[PDB]
Amino acid sequence: SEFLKNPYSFYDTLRAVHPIYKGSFLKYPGWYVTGYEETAAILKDARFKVRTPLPESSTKYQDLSHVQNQMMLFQNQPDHRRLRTLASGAFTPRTTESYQPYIIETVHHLLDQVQGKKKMEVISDFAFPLASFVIANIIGVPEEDREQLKEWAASLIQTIDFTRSRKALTEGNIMAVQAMAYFKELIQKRKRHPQQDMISMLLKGDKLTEEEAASTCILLAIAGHETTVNLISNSVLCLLQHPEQLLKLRENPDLIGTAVEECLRYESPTQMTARVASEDIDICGVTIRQGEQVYLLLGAANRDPSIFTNPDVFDITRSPNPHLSFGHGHHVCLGSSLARLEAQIAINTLLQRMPSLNLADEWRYRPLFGFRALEELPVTFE
Amino acid sequence: SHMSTIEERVKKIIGEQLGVKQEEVTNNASFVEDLGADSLDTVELVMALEEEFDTEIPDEEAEKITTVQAAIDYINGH
Numbered sequence: 187s188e189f190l191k192n193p194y195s196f197y198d199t200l201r202a203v204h205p206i207y208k209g210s211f212l213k214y215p216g217w218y219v220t221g222y223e224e225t226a227a228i229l230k231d232a233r234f235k236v237r238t239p240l241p242e243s244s245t246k247y248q249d250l251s252h253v254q255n256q257m258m259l260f261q262n263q264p265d266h267r268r269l270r271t272l273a274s275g276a277f278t279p280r281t282t283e284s285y286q287p288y289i290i291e292t293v294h295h296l297l298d299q300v301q302g303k304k305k306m307e308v309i310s311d312f313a314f315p316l317a318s319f320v321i322a323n324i325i326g327v328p329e330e331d332r333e334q335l336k337e338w339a340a341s342l343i344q345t346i347d348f349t350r351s352r353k354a355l356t357e358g359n360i361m362a363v364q365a366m367a368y369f370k371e372l373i374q375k376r377k378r379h380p381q382q383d384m385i386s387m388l389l390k391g392d393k394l395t396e397e398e399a400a401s402t403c404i405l406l407a408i409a410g411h412e413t414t415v416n417l418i419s420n421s422v423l424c425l426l427q428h429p430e431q432l433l434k435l436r437e438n439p440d441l442i443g444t445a446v447e448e449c450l451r452y453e454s455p456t457q458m459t460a461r462v463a464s465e466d467i468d469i470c471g472v473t474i475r476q477g478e479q480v481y482l483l484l485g486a487a488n489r490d491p492s493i494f495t496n497p498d499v500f501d502i503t504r505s506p507n508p509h510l511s512f513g514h515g516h517h518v519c520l521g522s523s524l525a526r527l528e529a530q531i532a533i534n535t536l537l538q539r540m541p542s543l544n545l546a547d548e549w550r551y552r553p554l555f556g557f558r559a560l561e562e563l564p565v566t567f568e
Numbered sequence: 569s570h571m572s573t574i575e576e577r578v579k580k581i582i583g584e585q586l587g588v589k590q591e592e593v594t595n596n597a598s599f600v601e602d603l604g605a606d607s608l609d610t611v612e613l614v615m616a617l618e619e620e621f622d623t624e625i626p627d628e629e630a631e632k633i634t635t636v637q638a639a640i641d642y643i644n645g646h
């Protein structure tokens with residue numbers, strides 16, 4: 187509870203001992219990396235491999251395991267590049283830019299429904315609907331099936347987190363069955379009748395199995411829901427807590443780019459990723475032995491004073507901003523351009539249409555250690 | 569008949585977790601080698617024991633416990 191309120195002092199104490207810290211947290215032993223250069227080095231180094239967040243040969247949650255293990259996020263060479271390249275078509279700079287019209291449209295529509303109310307819950311009324319509508323449209327999920335997709339994403343995100351329980355994983359296995367069955371049936375529809383969406387794109391193809399296509403859709407659905415919502419809401423809270431920076435941005439909307447980058451650095455939606463050592467590796471005056479787990483604390487690296495002067499100061503004018511919130515190396519976030527676009531449009535439009543935006547006043551974070559996610563963000567305006 | 573003893577409660581959990589008979593769980597059995605607990609099984613075992621016995625085991629102490637008896641001894645000692 188105190189960690190979730192302020193994880194950054196916890197990160198600081200680790201860094202002062204060693205930027206690569208041997209230890210154990212929530213029963214998970216390994217190397218905990220708070221150092222910027224160390225994080226970047228590990229993420230670039232292909233000898234540090236990605237791995238399934240459940241044991242490889244585990245059949246306790248057979249359907250959850252099968253869904254997870256087919257995702258590019260947990261695949262190495264040569265399967266990774268194949269899977270990533272096939273999905274990348276929907277997330278090119280040019281294709282991402284083509285989403286702008288729909289994003290602006292949805293943002294205004296969502297702000298319309300609350301404009302008269304003088305009050306709003308940023309997540310349920312704004313951040314979540316936008317992110318949900320956008321990613322469902324990109325994937326090709328009908329409007330009727332969008333609420334079901336929300337439920338799968340919220341359940342499945344838990345299954346990789348340190349805070350997971352036996353109950354979370356059992357529920358995760360059920361949602362895995364449901365999501366996989368749904369996307370297989372949607373793929374059968376798009377096979378007979380291709381549409382202008384990502385599912386059809388994946389079917390065209392060098393090529394994916396129909397299960398690989400389904401698991402790809404599930405991954406993007408989760409990423410589109412969870413982390414993007416966190417970015418938007420974290421950014422809004424961040425700006426409201428620093429009224430002088432908020433005023434700067436309201437007066438100068440062109441600062442939105444540099445402002446969103448500092449929100450990414452300062453309150454990173456993803457706080458952790460992980461690697462396993464495929465061999466003995468020497469780095470930063472320590473030896474990481476084959477098989478040992480490495481936990482990269484991206485939020486901690488983003489506060490490294492050797493890279494960011496006055497790291498605990500929120501400064502929207504920081505330039506440039508080489509934060510690690512989207513990761514680094516071969517697995518670097520596939521949808522980072524989309525996430526940035528959603529955030530930039532949402533925040534700028536919000537500040538424009540709600541000129542006297544204020545906090546409703548004690549924030550709760552969801553019980554996830556790998557993510558920085560608010561429970562809710564009540565605001566008042568007009 | 570009788571109420572569940574500490575030993576019986578520990579073995580019930582291990583049996584349910586690892587799909588073995590509650591009587592195939594010997595006190596001397598090692599979780600990893602003998603009972604075949606993987607790197608999720610052992611985490612889920614500690615969580616289940618923590619729940620059953622309403623206790624919090626530090627990571628350093630959990631690392632020490634390799635055998636059924638060691639788990640029984642820890643619960644008895646605490």
Ligand code: HEM
Pocket residue numbers: 236258259260270321405406409410411413414417450454455456459460510511512513514516517518519520521522524525
């Ligand atoms: C709708 C928006 C998003 C989509 C579709 C998306 C999708 C993806 C996918 C498919 C991957 C795996 C790529 C690979 O393994 O090669 C990935 C990786 C990653 N994403 Fe995103 N993402 C989105 C938004 C975000 C946001 C907002 C953040 C946090 C700021 C984020 C953080 C990351 C990180 C840190 C990785 C790399 C993890 C690792 O290296 O293990 N993503 N993303």
Ligand SMILES: *P(=O)(O)OCC(C)(C)[C@H](O)C(=O)NCCC(=O)NCCSC(=O)CCCCCCC/C=C\CCCCCC
Pocket residue numbers: 214237238239240241242254259342343345346347348405408409412413456458459460461479556606607608
């Ligand atoms: P053994 O067989 O020796 O145990 C190893 C194992 C199984 C890894 C074990 O559980 C463990 O040591 N640790 C588990 C904890 C763990 O590693 N968790 C994963 C940490 S985070 C991660 O690896 C990367 C995910 C972060 C990227 C987020 C960006 C995209 C957004 C959402 C992704 C949704 C993916 C969920 C799929 C179900």
Ligand SMILES: [Cl-]
Pocket residue numbers: 428429430431
């Ligand atoms: Cl300020």
